[PDB]
Swiss-Prot record:
Location relative to the cell: Cytoplasm
Upper classification of the organism: Bacteria, Bacillati, Bacillota, Bacilli, Bacillales
Gene: cspLA
UniProt protein name: Cold shock-like protein CspLA
Main location as per UniProt: cytoplasm
Keyword Transcription regulation: yes
Induction text: In response to low temperature.
Organism: Listeria monocytogenes serovar 1/2a (strain ATCC BAA-679 / EGD-e)
Length: 66
């Protein structure tokens, strides 16, 4: 149920941040992005996905469009 709004994507590094109630700093990266043309993450759009926290660091995995 890791649904949230994409806050912004720092293309400088290649990381996107998505805002959640539990944490507004979810690292989304295009290594877990879907297809169907939806390979673009844009600030202010809503998405649904899964989040796997690593060694202090919640990253997004399995990204689906809301």
């Amino acid at each position: 149920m890791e649904q949230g709004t994409v806050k912004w994507f720092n293309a400088e590094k290649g990381f996107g941040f998505i805002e959640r109630e539990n944490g507004d700093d979810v690292f989304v990266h295009f290594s877990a992005i879907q297809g169907d043309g939806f390979k673009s993450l844009d600030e202010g759009q809503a998405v649904t996905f899964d989040v796997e926290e690593g060694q202090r660091g919640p990253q997004a995995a399995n990204v689906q469009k809301a």
